[PDB]
Amino acid sequence: RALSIFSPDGHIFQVEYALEAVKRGTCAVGVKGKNCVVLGCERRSTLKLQDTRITPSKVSKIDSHVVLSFSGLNADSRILIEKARVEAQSHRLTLEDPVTVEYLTRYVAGVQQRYTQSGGVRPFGVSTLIAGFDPRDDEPKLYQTEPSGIYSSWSAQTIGRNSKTVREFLEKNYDRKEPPATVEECVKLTVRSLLEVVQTGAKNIEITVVKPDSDIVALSSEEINQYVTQIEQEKQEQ
Amino acid sequence: TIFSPEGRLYQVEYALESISHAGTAIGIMASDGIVLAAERKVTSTLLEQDTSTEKLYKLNDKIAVAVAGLTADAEILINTARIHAQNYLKTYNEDIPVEILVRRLSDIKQGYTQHGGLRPFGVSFIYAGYDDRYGYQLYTSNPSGNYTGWKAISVGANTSAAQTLLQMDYKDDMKVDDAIELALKTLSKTTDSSALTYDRLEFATIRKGANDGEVYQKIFKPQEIKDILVKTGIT
Amino acid sequence: YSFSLTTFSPSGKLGQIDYALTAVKQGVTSLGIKATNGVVIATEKKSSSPLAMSETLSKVSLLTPDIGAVYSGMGPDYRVLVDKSRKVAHTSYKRIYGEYPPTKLLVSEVAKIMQEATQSGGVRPFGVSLLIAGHDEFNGFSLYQVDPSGSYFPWKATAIGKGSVAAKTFLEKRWNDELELEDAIHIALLTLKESVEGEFNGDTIELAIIGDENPDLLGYTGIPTDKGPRFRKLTSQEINDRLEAL
Amino acid sequence: NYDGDTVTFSPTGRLFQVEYALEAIKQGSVTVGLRSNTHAVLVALKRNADELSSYQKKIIKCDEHMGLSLAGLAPDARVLSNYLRQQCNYSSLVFNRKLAVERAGHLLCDKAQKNTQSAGGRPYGVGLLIIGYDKSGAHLLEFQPSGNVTELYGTAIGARSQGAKTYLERTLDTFIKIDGNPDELIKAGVEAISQSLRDESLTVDNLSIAIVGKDTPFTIYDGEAVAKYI
Amino acid sequence: TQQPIVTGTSVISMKYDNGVIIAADNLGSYGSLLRFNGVERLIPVGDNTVVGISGDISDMQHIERLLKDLVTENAYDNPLADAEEALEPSYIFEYLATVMYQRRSKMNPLWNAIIVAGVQSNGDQFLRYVNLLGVTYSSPTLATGFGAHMANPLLRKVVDRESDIPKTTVQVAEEAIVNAMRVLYYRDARSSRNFSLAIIDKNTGLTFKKNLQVENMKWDFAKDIKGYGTQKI
Amino acid sequence: QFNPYGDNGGTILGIAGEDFAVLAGDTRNITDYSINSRYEPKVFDCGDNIVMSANGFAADGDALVKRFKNSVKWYHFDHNDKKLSINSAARNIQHLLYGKRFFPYYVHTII
Amino acid sequence: GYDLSNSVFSPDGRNFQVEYAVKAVENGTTSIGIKCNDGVVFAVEKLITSKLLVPQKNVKIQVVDRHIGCVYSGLIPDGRHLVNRGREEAASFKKLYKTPIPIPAFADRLGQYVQAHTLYNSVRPFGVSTIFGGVDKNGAHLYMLEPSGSYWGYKGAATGKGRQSAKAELEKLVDHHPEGLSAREAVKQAAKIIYLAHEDNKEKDFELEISWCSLSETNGLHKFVKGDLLQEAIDFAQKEIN
Amino acid sequence: VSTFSPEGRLFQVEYSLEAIKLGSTAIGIATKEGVVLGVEKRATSPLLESDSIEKIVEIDRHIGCAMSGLTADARSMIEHARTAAVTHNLYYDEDINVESLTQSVCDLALRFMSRPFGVALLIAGHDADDGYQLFHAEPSGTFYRYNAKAIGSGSEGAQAELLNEWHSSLTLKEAELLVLKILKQVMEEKLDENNAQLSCITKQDGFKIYDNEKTAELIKELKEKEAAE
Amino acid sequence: DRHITIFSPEGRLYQVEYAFKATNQTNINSLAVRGKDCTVVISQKKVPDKLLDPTTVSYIFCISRTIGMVVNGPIPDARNAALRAKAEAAEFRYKYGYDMPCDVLAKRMANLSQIYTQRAYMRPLGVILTFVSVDEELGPSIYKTDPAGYYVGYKATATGPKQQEITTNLENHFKKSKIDHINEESWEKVVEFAITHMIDALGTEFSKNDLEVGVATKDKFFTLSAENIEERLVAIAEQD
Numbered sequence A: 001r002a003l004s005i006f007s008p009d010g011h012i013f014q015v016e017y018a019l020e021a022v023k024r025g026t027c028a029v030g031v032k033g034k035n036c037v038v039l040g041c042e043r044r045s046t047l048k049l050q051d052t053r054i055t056p057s058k059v060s061k062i063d064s065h066v067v068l069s070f071s072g073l074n075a076d077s078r079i080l081i082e083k084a085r086v087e088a089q090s091h092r093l094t095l096e097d098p099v100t101v102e103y104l105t106r107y108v109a110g111v112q113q114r115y116t117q118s119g120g121v122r123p124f125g126v127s128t129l130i131a132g133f134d135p136r137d138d139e140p141k142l143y144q145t146e147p148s149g150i151y152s153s154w155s156a157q158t159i160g161r162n163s164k165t166v167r168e169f170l171e172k173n174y175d176r177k178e179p180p181a182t183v184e185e186c187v188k189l190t191v192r193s194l195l196e197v198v199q200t201g202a203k204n205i206e207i208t209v210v211k212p213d214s215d216i217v218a219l220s221s222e223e224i225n226q227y228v229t230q231i232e233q234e235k236q237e238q
Numbered sequence B: 001t002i003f004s005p006e007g008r009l010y011q012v013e014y015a016l017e018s019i020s021h022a023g024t025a026i027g028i029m030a031s032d033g034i035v036l037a038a039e040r041k042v043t044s045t046l047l048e049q050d051t052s053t054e055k056l057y058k059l060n061d062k063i064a065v066a067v068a069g070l071t072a073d074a075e076i077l078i079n080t081a082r083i084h085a086q087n088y089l090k091t092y093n094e095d096i097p098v099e100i101l102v103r104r105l106s107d108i109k110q111g112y113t114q115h116g117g118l119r120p121f122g123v124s125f126i127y128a129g130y131d132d133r134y135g136y137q138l139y140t141s142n143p144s145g146n147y148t149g150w151k152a153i154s155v156g157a158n159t160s161a162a163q164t165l166l167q168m169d170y171k172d173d174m175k176v177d178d179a180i181e182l183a184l185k186t187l188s189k190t191t192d193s194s195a196l197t198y199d200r201l202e203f204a205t206i207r208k209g210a211n212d213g214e215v216y217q218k219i220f221k222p223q224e225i226k227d228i229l230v231k232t233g234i235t
Numbered sequence C: 001y002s003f004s005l006t007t008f009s010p011s012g013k014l015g016q017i018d019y020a021l022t023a024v025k026q027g028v029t030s031l032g033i034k035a036t037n038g039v040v041i042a043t044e045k046k047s048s049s050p051l052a053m054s055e056t057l058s059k060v061s062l063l064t065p066d067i068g069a070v071y072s073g074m075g076p077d078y079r080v081l082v083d084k085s086r087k088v089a090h091t092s093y094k095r096i097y098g099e100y101p102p103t104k105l106l107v108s109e110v111a112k113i114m115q116e117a118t119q120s121g122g123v124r125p126f127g128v129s130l131l132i133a134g135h136d137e138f139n140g141f142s143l144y145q146v147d148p149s150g151s152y153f154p155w156k157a158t159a160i161g162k163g164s165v166a167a168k169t170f171l172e173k174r175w176n177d178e179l180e181l182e183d184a185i186h187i188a189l190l191t192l193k194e195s196v197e198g199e200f201n202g203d204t205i206e207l208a209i210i211g212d213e214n215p216d217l218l219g220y221t222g223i224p225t226d227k228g229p230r231f232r233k234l235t236s237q238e239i240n241d242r243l244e245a246l
Numbered sequence D: 001n002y003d004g005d006t007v008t009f010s011p012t013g014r015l016f017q018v019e020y021a022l023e024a025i026k027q028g029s030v031t032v033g034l035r036s037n038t039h040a041v042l043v044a045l046k047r048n049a050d051e052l053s054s055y056q057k058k059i060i061k062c063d064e065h066m067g068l069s070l071a072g073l074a075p076d077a078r079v080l081s082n083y084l085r086q087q088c089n090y091s092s093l094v095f096n097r098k099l100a101v102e103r104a105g106h107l108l109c110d111k112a113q114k115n116t117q118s119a120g121g122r123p124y125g126v127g128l129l130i131i132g133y134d135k136s137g138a139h140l141l142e143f144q145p146s147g148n149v150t151e152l153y154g155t156a157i158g159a160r161s162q163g164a165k166t167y168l169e170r171t172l173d174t175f176i177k178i179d180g181n182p183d184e185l186i187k188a189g190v191e192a193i194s195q196s197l198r199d200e201s202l203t204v205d206n207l208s209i210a211i212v213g214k215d216t217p218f219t220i221y222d223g224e225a226v227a228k229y230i
Numbered sequence E: 001t002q003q004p005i006v007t008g009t010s011v012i013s014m015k016y017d018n019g020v021i022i023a024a025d026n027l028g029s030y031g032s033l034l035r036f037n038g039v040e041r042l043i044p045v046g047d048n049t050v051v052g053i054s055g056d057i058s059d060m061q062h063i064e065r066l067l068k069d070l071v072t073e074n075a076y077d078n079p080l081a082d083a084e085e086a087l088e089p090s091y092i093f094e095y096l097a098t099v100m101y102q103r104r105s106k107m108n109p110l111w112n113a114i115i116v117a118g119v120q121s122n123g124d125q126f127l128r129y130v131n132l133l134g135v136t137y138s139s140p141t142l143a144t145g146f147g148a149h150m151a152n153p154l155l156r157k158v159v160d161r162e163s164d165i166p167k168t169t170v171q172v173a174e175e176a177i178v179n180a181m182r183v184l185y186y187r188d189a190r191s192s193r194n195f196s197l198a199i200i201d202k203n204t205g206l207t208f209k210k211n212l213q214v215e216n217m218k219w220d221f222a223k224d225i226k227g228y229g230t231q232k233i
Numbered sequence F: 001q002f003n004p005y006g007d008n009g010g011t012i013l014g015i016a017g018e019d020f021a022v023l024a025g026d027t028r029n030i031t032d033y034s035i036n037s038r039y040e041p042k043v044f045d046c047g048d049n050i051v052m053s054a055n056g057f058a059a060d061g062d063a064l065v066k067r068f069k070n071s072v073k074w075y076h077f078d079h080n081d082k083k084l085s086i087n088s089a090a091r092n093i094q095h096l097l098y099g100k101r102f103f104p105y106y107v108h109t110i111i
Numbered sequence G: 001g002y003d004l005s006n007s008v009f010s011p012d013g014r015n016f017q018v019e020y021a022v023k024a025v026e027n028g029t030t031s032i033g034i035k036c037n038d039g040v041v042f043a044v045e046k047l048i049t050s051k052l053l054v055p056q057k058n059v060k061i062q063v064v065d066r067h068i069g070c071v072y073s074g075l076i077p078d079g080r081h082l083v084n085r086g087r088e089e090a091a092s093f094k095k096l097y098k099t100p101i102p103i104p105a106f107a108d109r110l111g112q113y114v115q116a117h118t119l120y121n122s123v124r125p126f127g128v129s130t131i132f133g134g135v136d137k138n139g140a141h142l143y144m145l146e147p148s149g150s151y152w153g154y155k156g157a158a159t160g161k162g163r164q165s166a167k168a169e170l171e172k173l174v175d176h177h178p179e180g181l182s183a184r185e186a187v188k189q190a191a192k193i194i195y196l197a198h199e200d201n202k203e204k205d206f207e208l209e210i211s212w213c214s215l216s217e218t219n220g221l222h223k224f225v226k227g228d229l230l231q232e233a234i235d236f237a238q239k240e241i242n
Numbered sequence H: 001v002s003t004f005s006p007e008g009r010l011f012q013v014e015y016s017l018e019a020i021k022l023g024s025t026a027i028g029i030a031t032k033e034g035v036v037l038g039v040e041k042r043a044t045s046p047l048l049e050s051d052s053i054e055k056i057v058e059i060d061r062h063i064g065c066a067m068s069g070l071t072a073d074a075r076s077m078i079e080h081a082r083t084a085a086v087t088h089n090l091y092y093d094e095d096i097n098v099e100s101l102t103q104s105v106c107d108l109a110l111r112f113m114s115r116p117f118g119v120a121l122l123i124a125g126h127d128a129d130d131g132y133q134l135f136h137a138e139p140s141g142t143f144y145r146y147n148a149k150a151i152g153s154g155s156e157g158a159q160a161e162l163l164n165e166w167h168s169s170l171t172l173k174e175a176e177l178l179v180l181k182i183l184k185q186v187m188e189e190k191l192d193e194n195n196a197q198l199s200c201i202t203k204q205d206g207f208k209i210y211d212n213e214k215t216a217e218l219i220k221e222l223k224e225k226e227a228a229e
Numbered sequence I: 001d002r003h004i005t006i007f008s009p010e011g012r013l014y015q016v017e018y019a020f021k022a023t024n025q026t027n028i029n030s031l032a033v034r035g036k037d038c039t040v041v042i043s044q045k046k047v048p049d050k051l052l053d054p055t056t057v058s059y060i061f062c063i064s065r066t067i068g069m070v071v072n073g074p075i076p077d078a079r080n081a082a083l084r085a086k087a088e089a090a091e092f093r094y095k096y097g098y099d100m101p102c103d104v105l106a107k108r109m110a111n112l113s114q115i116y117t118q119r120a121y122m123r124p125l126g127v128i129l130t131f132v133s134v135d136e137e138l139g140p141s142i143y144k145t146d147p148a149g150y151y152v153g154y155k156a157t158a159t160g161p162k163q164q165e166i167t168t169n170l171e172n173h174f175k176k177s178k179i180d181h182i183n184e185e186s187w188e189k190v191v192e193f194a195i196t197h198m199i200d201a202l203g204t205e206f207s208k209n210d211l212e213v214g215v216a217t218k219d220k221f222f223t224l225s226a227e228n229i230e231e232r233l234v235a236i237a238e239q240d
């Protein structure tokens, strides 16, 4: 039974409405430095009394050198992440090389695309940011996928609720001529951009740094809180 | 299994709605254990509360669930959860980590969300479990296939009321006996009924016995609930 | 037609299960009472015409030698569930463990069959409610009610269909945890008198007990570890005997 | 409310989805078929989308002795002519027997019929003219997606088909006698196709011709090879 | 993968100037037991074709049925099912050849050797052989089983090459076939005295002869033969 | 047990000249020590100016030649009447043969 | 819309898709069958749409096995589909039982197949009404089968546009020949009835087609009436129309 | 999904074509010295890295293609086309004919998967029998050969300009300029080397995508040629 | 909701209700009665069309050697039910080694009907089936199934448009006689009784071509010819 069909204006409404669920999803951003890529995600507010030790954070490891973050339906994202992890191992097994970030993106994009044209399935209510480094290479990588299956690379990019806003920020603040040559000033730009939408919070913003050769570290509440302080100072210094 | 113009899943929303009328269940995570308490919706003098089970189910020796929603839909999912646990144990010779079992169940639910043209299960679960990686854990899953972990949480009828109270009285350095108390008080103030009696309750605890080194699952007998009611001054 | 015909409405109701319950509501009344040494299930044999043969219809059915069932709602729906239930008692249990299942587990399986009709594609829920009475070595005597949703619950006593509301009430007055079986039969006969309109005799009333073991209904002697069926349908003659002493 | 699927009759006993499929033909560029006793000819005016575009191929060979012209959905002509290729092929391999044109007709009718009777499918949306030379001489056939097939001395289908069908309806006694004369049957065909033109004078790209006969295998003529017929 | 049980022996045939002749005896053997004596192994299809079959009789009966269906089906929606679009010897053969080779390819053969004799609508004589392996060949004479070994040599003395066919009359050809059938009854322990013969002539059509018998048999010299070497009486 | 193969004898020979080629065969067909036919051709014109012979088990050889002639027909159908070059024929014949690697055509093929 | 799917009963116990199928039949060319004393005759009306139709070439009567005639009015493709299935059904009876299929047996085979297509909402009923029969081991039989799968044996039968005219004519024959009717006669009478019935359709000119299966006239095989005997019947019908 | 309108068109196929009209422009020109394919990148933002926009792809050394519409839908067509060209080479030791490759992609297109493709393709190539060729493949399963063609949002305008400018002796260099020109006219943005991409296929060198530096030089040469009248 | 067999808000199945309606379409009445050692079924026979071959117009079916069945409903559906039951009764014999009893076949057809009641893709059959036999265990037997999946055994029964009149007429005979069968030894008298009571309740007289009679004896079920029926009609015409 065909659920994803065309309408008279030439629009696939289910694909279209899937985008609306992404818009409703908590925000996520990624910016890519001269020798790094940083991923940042806001935290929800339906309830608070949660256990954060066990609850799945918003950035998933796919292989040791590639990470995936998303905005949209949480349950839909698990399914894409599983398939991505399975493919990552399968590529190693048959090509004796880990996936390029572009290849893993094309894979995930393909999966989403496939669900836009099969009977009895609804598209994925998910957009992904996929970030990391190709094996034996130092040039940083960042890619976006969407429920239609389109994908592309980004100097920087944001998705989810109020991404409209944060894309405005980055469009004037990210200089292609001068990518944030430090891990530090890369996290700085990533925090500034999230601040515009988050409405002040240390337990609101989470950050993950990815460097070459499988170097990926999550930050702590306090480590981020240090950037929170120095940004709210330099704005109040004016 | 279709999207609304707004980006919401009709049948899922409506299933959550179904659940919001089911008897309440509460999970509270202590330092040295976990409490499960649940209220039986629709009762009678003639209903056999002794040889009864409708909201609290054992999944494993280290994991129990509390059910809000359609009982029969729940048994389907409990049964496949019990099997997944056993497959894990057979495969690895280790009891299944709580998260893994929970992820599996959520995935099954998510399936009905995304394909097949069949109605979602009208069920929400609270998971109480222990494993050697994270110790005590409390989880929740609903028809959307979404799952999250909690210090305290409630499902079914009157969650806003019950949630507020738990937030008000819960503290990190709690002990199990206090959590038992907190569970009963919270149900006591959110009941759609006259007063909280023993025949309207199911109760379970997961405690790491001080004499041994292993974890014990207790599903309270009718008389045992009745007793634990007097102590806390609800007689 | 591979989609579910039972879906959620915006109010969160499942329409088809409700409508199934309504069909159960129009059904002839049936009841079960649990005694200390027995369980009794009972119902009315609504003859559609006096030309029809009352005996030729099982409203009370043996599921295993220790488990009986009675129903309210749609007769034909019940009849296929009895068949599927007997078979599942074998395929899921006796062929595995060499003993018949305990009441709660058989009930569990029936409930499963009904749930599936609530969710599988191209089907409608069963339009019945069952009262299932039985015994097993470890749980003793029990009585359970199963509904179109696949939900089940244990009762000390209950009644379903047409005149259920009044009958639940009448039972509540009469039930104590010290009843002998003969007492439960008597109470069952009283409750049934209120719901029935026309004739009220052994040929319009069907009753079965789950009582003691009946060695003379076994078919063979020799193995003393086998004592025979606990389920027994009462005869037309046996009912009338207890009616005259009302 | 009755034109949802082919599995549905209207209150007057019509199948609308079939009728609508028939409609796609009337948008197809015109094509003509005709036969004497020694040959059969297809003339198919091809239609162009733009002046930079091909005048899309309307004639498909089916065997050394059989072929067809299409008016309507080209993809559907490809499904059906392909099935016809297989059926003609089967006749050769298994029986060493060239497939009778009539027999092709019955096979197409039956293939089209199934598609008018089962949910999920749709009627074919293409009409076909079928010529062949077999063991009983020359043959022309008209296929409609409803599954109706008819054997004719001549005919036309597509837009304004009626003109050529009228010309042929009168010229009947003149062409049926063009035995042993190939070029004069193509002439008569071309002279018939123009009675349904309006657009223009038929050019060297406009035209497609196909002939089969007594000692002539089915051959398609395009362009420079058809210049002598304009 | 199987084994022949009830069997038929040689089928022999040759073309002459105006048609083709085919013959076969009327026995069905069961190993060495000569079990059934009334068995027709020449199968006429229409008025222009005879199909002669040796080997397993149960498979033979299966092939009969196929040929009857072939006729029925050919008549369906065919106004000329018996004119121009009547079944030809070449069509019947290519059908059977196909089946035979498909069945061997599935390791489940029809345990037979088949000769298809007849006259094509353009008057051409048709004579072609196919067997359990799907091997097919044509010759001015054809024979299966023992016929291959004894009948071919005799029949080839009448028609040794293609150019001999216009020289050969029905009378000469039928005489050769009848003689070869006698020899086969002399030397083939699975042969029978009773046989059937059929001629398909481009003018006379199909003549089908039943209940023929081998006649003019030389046995008389047997009386003079005593012992196996030295014995005098 | 049933043996799916036989051997019908015969012999074939191919020679390439500068601007021609010959492929030759005998016309005899045999089984064991008997002659089936003195004139049963086994070298065939296949269209597109290709000649083929598949010599050994004649049943297998016939199947292959049939399947190749049919291949050529469909090549014209699928590729706008293109002439099948001899190298392309060769490769195609490889695939026909190899498709039967586990139950082979018992023939030596020359084109 | 108690008509937007097949397997739906309307509130009066009728099947609405079947009853629309009947409309499509009534909309069709007329065809008949006449049982005679040792056979059956079949005739049909072929509308000459145009001068360009090759005469005697678009045959509409169909043989099944060798002893059964089939003719139909409605959607021609639906008729063919039914005959194809009739033929598979006759082959399978012969294969298993050796004897060719008895006409009653063949009738129930079609009955059941047609009836199946009135059971599921994913299939539409057949838009034809079929007249068929032949000679089996005990007599000639004639049948008519409706889009519902309903069939009965008939002395005479008619379907299509000119059906009432034809039915009236047939009734006159039944009443005036209790003794019986020769195959030869029935052939002419069929020709008459087709010409008479062409009145309820007399816009386009028509071509006549007849076939028959008689014990003493065809040995109990189905054959088309051709040349001489066909002309004799066309003449007989032309004569007795004035 | 497989329904006819009373006009006898396929609803889903017609709506599919509407989706294509919403896509970036793609232009192809066929000469006797080669066939040129050009596209409009259309980045939805300046942060997007324009070189990651793949709307011209290689199918085989002698066959390239440009797309327009829901471009995600084209992955499985390109894959099928590549497999078909490679398979043909495996089975026949030769290059697939351009028309045959297009027919195979159109065959895939017919296979109503829940819906038609929301993408049209320009398939350009060379082969020995029929020379340089250009094809338009719609999600209908129909394909058309063109001397010149344009698809996507600027097509109606572009097709007219192609009608004017095309003649059967355009040199390859002339044709390249024409693609840039017509793209410059129909694009929302100002045409530069980062938002337009050129490619060609010549017999001698196969399908080559032009790098940005080589495209820039052609843009510059185009501006200078037009500033004369 | 009125097209497929889902429940209506009142807990009803409209399609099944409509299927009961269809059972009356033929405007025929039948009745079944039991003798001492036989079982009789009578049904009206109406051949409106002069063009019909009357011998082929029947609503009585020989299911097996021992079991007959009469249908009230349209013929296509009736034949479909007859084929299935024939098929079913032959299978039972092969798998179980004894003849399918009448009531077991009734139960089996009931369950099949119950499925069309429950699954959306199958319409119910617009028919009521009366099965009759002399069972080797039970004696003379009548079992009747409807489109709901319902079935039961009867002392006697009747079906069709005037069902109710025939039924009460029969109830009245049994009230008076005090027995549950026709106390007659020969099946000829049971048929005679059956016709008489159908006359007395339809207000109609019958000629030989207006009826159809099926009798079940120990080890045979048979249908009467027009001639045996005539002999029955003559004999009643000396009582009544």
Ligand SMILES: [Mg+2]
Pocket (backbone or CB within 6 Å): F083, F084, F085, F088, H094
């Ligand atoms: Mg080549």
Ligand SMILES: [Mg+2]
Pocket (backbone or CB within 6 Å): G163
């Ligand atoms: Mg009528």
Ligand SMILES: [Mg+2]
Pocket (backbone or CB within 6 Å): I004, I005, I115, I116, I117, I118, I119, I120, I121, I122, I123, I124
């Ligand atoms: Mg149904």
Ligand SMILES: [Mg+2]
Pocket (backbone or CB within 6 Å): G007, G008, G119, G120, G121, I004, I120, I121, I122, I123
């Ligand atoms: Mg249905």
